[PDB]
Amino acid sequence: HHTMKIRSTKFSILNSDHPRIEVKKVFSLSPDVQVTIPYRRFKGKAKVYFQNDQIQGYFSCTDRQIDEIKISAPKNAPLLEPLLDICYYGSFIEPGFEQTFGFYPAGKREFVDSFFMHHSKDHKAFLIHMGLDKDLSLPLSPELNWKEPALSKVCRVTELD
């Protein structure tokens, strides 16, 4: 049906220029040794509602770039894992889609599992994707905790109206 799920986070497309498209990415060591690991992404604009338990909101993207995220969440909620679900959903950060994790992948299952392991341990890819701001009135801390105090904040992540 319409709603789709990445881990525990449900996604529902509000509107989009096109349906999600599939990229049949191929990784190779030699002609005889190569895996096909496809991923899905957006072509053009998209606005998508998401929800994970006490956390909900929506985000806007253009192709493989997040334009904005609006979130509603409890104070001091750790937003690491659901944000990664969004990142995977749109294939917004590497490695995990066009790049490997520093070693030739075993297959689809391994590649997806590697994504969440790798980026949980080190999530700067996301910070680079959004940007870090000097404005403190913004809600999301660099450690990706909701409304946590900090000397800098994550760009273009605000609170839902």
Author numbering: 325 to 485
What's written in the study?
The three largest gene segments of the Thogotoviruses, THOV, DHOV and JOSV are homologous to those of IAV and code for the heterotrimeric polymerase. However, the critical active site residues in the putative cap binding and endonuclease domains are not conserved in THOV and DHOV and, contrary to the case of IAV polymerase, neither domain shows the expected in vitro biochemical activity.
A construct comprising residues 323–486 could be expressed, crystallised in two different forms, and its structure determined at 1.8 Å resolution. Firstly, the so called ‘348-loop’ formed by the β3–β4 hairpin is longer in THOV and its extremity orientates away from the body of the domain towards the solvent, whereas in IAV the tip packs against bends the body of the molecule. This is apparently not an artefact of crystal packing as a very similar conformation of this beta hairpin is observed in the second crystal form. Thus the significantly different nature and arrangement of the residues within the putative active site of THOV would appear to preclude any possible binding of m7G in a similar manner to that observed in IAV.
